[model samples]
Target: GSHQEYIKKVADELKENSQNINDLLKEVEKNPEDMEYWNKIYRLLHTNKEIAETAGFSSVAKVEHTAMNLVDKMLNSEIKITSDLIDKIKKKVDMSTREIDKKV
Candidate 1:
């Protein structure tokens, strides 16, 4: 029960954080050239990945892993930031968050 409770707590926090990420996505949309916004998005996804793994939601964890790779490409300047890419990332994040909710 304790492990379940812990997972629930982590899931709750991650869900809340995901909202913040959604807001950040909107900000990035408004100012697509802002590197800070991109960095914040990357950091938020990175945090999401950690929480998913900690809570033992492997489906969400895998999604986060894939998202991280995309984020890394953006961070390393390997890929230019685009609205399409951002939308794709946001969709994946939402899917992962939903999966975590179901597990919790």
Candidate 2:
């Protein structure tokens, strides 16, 4: 989708982040089971979390960071990507996407 739905939250930063998140969504849709996709998705989330906090959206950043850490657990095989886990990740993304639209 388009970042146009939101006012430029953090100028270029959040716009690109939203785009990255959207891209990650598509990738997840393609196959959330793929290890490579999870690797990339989690990495992006880690990076984006920093950007989001720096831009004054720690409200959002906190969850993203948490999700990234959880993904790390899965990456290390400490945890499996259960459907419940997927829902958790999905909730943060979808909710934040809406937040990005509704407010900062």
Candidate 3:
């Protein structure tokens, strides 16, 4: 594959995360306390994280991984969900794209 083609493949990986981010943003806004939706978000992000690993963008890879771990902790009660929690979650979900998009 050409170098440009490789970049496009990585771009495709990030593209899915854009939609995944949208899904959780709306769902979290709709129901902050619902772990079901959070769990689904966790799963989606985890998968996205894995995709990033093979593609060779280390920064993009870890962004999703850290988000996944934070959500996992929240689900497991290691972290508390306060009013700020939602704000922080939304903030981070917002970040998930910017870190990669800016470079792109």
Candidate 4:
């Protein structure tokens, strides 16, 4: 019972966080050039990435790596984050995750 309860609790938390992250990602897409939006996106992805890594989810780790790489690039750039840049970053994240999912 204890093991089952732990698994259920973890699953529920993951689901909730994933939903939150997805919603935030959509918001970022709608306002891609907003610095605050980008910051939220970065934070959400970073949180999820850490969780995925800790859980030993290789596919998720790859996705997180791509997300982090893109976010870091955007943060270092002088130009504000744009929809085009966001699209590019999303594409990389999708690509990396898909590859990992396929492998797994």
Candidate 5:
């Protein structure tokens, strides 16, 4: 596929996954002990991983990979999940989404 096609697809997928994370964040906020939401979020984080192998998308993928690790830590209870952490993840996702838009 052309680079533009790859970029556009990744951009669209990232925004959708970010929205999924935001929605799950709200759920986890209200019911902090719910592993359901956390697990769902972690799975959704993997949604865009494959497309990010493209050279232009590598950095953004790394950012998202970092976010995935955070979620994994939270899931394992190695890192306490909190509003601050959620905000951090959201910020990373937003930053990546913006980067994708910039390239477009």
Candidate 6:
């Protein structure tokens, strides 16, 4: 597929995923102990993995992979889940979405 097609599809998926990420972030904010939120995080990352691969968004995929690891750490209580991290993630997602938009 063309870069436009790849970017459009990849960016659209990220746009939708960002909303999901926001919601999950809220849930974690309200109750950081919620293991269910981690599950959702894993699911989101899992889908992104495939989409990023299909779209050849290697850097985006790597970012998501790192986010996935953070969730894992949070689940294990190895790291604290903080709003700052969520905000950063949202910013990253938004920036990536706009990066693709600039191309298309």
**Using alpha carbons, what is the TM-score of model 3?**
0.75
Q: Indicate the worst ten consecutive residues by lDDT in candidate 1.
A: 64-73
Error of 3 at 51 (Å): 1.0
Candidate 6 residue 44 Cα shift, in angstroms, is 0.6
lDDT of 3 by residue, 46-78 (tens): 776676667655366676777677678779977
Candidate 2 global lDDT = 0.64
- Model 4's lDDT to the true fold? 0.60
Better of 3 and 4 by lDDT: 3
After superposition on all C-alphas, the RMSD of every candidate to the true structure, in Å, is 1.7, 5.4, 2.4, 4.5, 2.1, 2.7
C-alpha TM-score for every candidate? 0.85, 0.68, 0.75, 0.61, 0.81, 0.72
Which candidate comes out best when scored by lDDT? 1
lDDT, candidate 4, 1-104, per-residue tens: 46445434444444454455556667877766666655765676677667656655546556666766677776667657777767666665555444334434
Displacement of residue 25 (Cα, Å) in model 1 is: 0.8
Query: Taking the tens digit of each residue's C-alpha lDDT, what string does model 5 give over 1-104?
Result: 59777677767877787778878887888877667887987777676655665546636676778778878888898766877778778877777676667766
Off by over 4 Å in 2: 1-33, 102-104
Better candidate number, 3 or 5, judged by TM-score = 5
How do all the candidates rank in terms of lDDT, highest first? 1, 5, 6, 3, 2, 4
Q: Record all residue pairs in model 6 with backbone atoms less than 3 Å apart, i.e. clashing.
A: none
- The positional error of residue 78 in candidate 1, measured at the CA in angstroms, is 2.2
Candidate 2, 1-104: lDDT as tens digits: 54443336454455466567657656765665667767876866777677666655536677777667767777887765676766677777665555455444
lDDT values of the candidates?
0.76, 0.64, 0.68, 0.60, 0.74, 0.68
Candidate 6 lDDT, 32-78, residue by residue in tens: 76778877877787686667667766366666776677777777777
Of 1 and 3, the candidate ahead on TM-score is: 1
Task: Give the clashing residue pairs of candidate 2, or none.
Answer: none
On residues 32-98, what C-alpha lDDT tens digit does candidate 1 reach at each position?
6667866876677788777777767748778767766766677777767788878887987788778
User: Which stretches of model 3 miss by more than 4 angstroms?
Assistant: 102-104
